[PDB]
Symmetry: C2
Subunit: 133 residues, 2 copies
């Protein structure tokens, strides 16, 4: 049975959280939200540096930022030397969207993390880290 595979059950949890995220924030996906968190944490960050926050490829991040910039969420400036390298900022409207979404995303995470104690949450984090490093 697929219920006995750890990574199948992982996709069940990931899609349950994504479905709840899409219901509460239909206009801000998790990769879009995480990218905005990184821009607000480091204004003027290099566009390529947002790959880690996006957990995506260069093309997916380029398409994501182009749509975000078209929706008035982010603004970008090019390098005078290499006009392909870009620096990303949050627009004033983008900071309002991000500020309103942070408690919504936290409560969506709390719907699942709340079923775990503090020790179980930190232990879930350590298990996921060991599987990647």
């Amino acid at each position: 049975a697929l219920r006995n595979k750890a990574f199948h059950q992982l996709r069940q949890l990931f899609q349950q959280h994504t479905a709840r995220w899409q219901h509460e924030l239909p206009d801000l996906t998790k990769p879009q939200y995480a990218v905005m968190r990184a821009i607000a944490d480091k204004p003027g960050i290099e566009q390529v540096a947002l790959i880690e926050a996006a957990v995506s490829t260069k093309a997916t991040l380029a398409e994501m930022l182009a749509r975000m910039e078209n929706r008035g969420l982010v603004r970008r400036e090019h390098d005078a030397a290499d006009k392909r390298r870009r620096f990303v900022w949050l627009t004033a409207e983008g900071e309002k969207v991000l500020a309103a979404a942070i408690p919504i995303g936290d409560s969506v995470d709390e719907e699942f993390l709340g079923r775990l104690s503090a020790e179980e949450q930190e232990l879930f984090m350590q298990l996921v880290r060991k599987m990647m490093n």
Copy 2:
């Protein structure tokens, strides 16, 4: 930092496993592979019943099975009463593709699960289950 969010790090692990899965099996995604496992486990299963294995909506499963059936992987039969309700079987070619992919997917899972002991793997499974039930 996003590295301190449990569900962001969960997406990092899920995309790392997906990227490795796409490199080893570029023509069989995880939702396609899991659906084929369910069909081989229950030949003639109802199409709607494959939603749990697909971890998707009805439209995503309908599009997935239509592409799979077009590629000669599955075959379908309709209900004489309600021709929209369908039963799914694996074609002879589909069983060859599934048999060859099972050890490939297992080794992809082992690339990450191998970093954990047996107790840590079962404990990762229990933590994910408690977050959903």
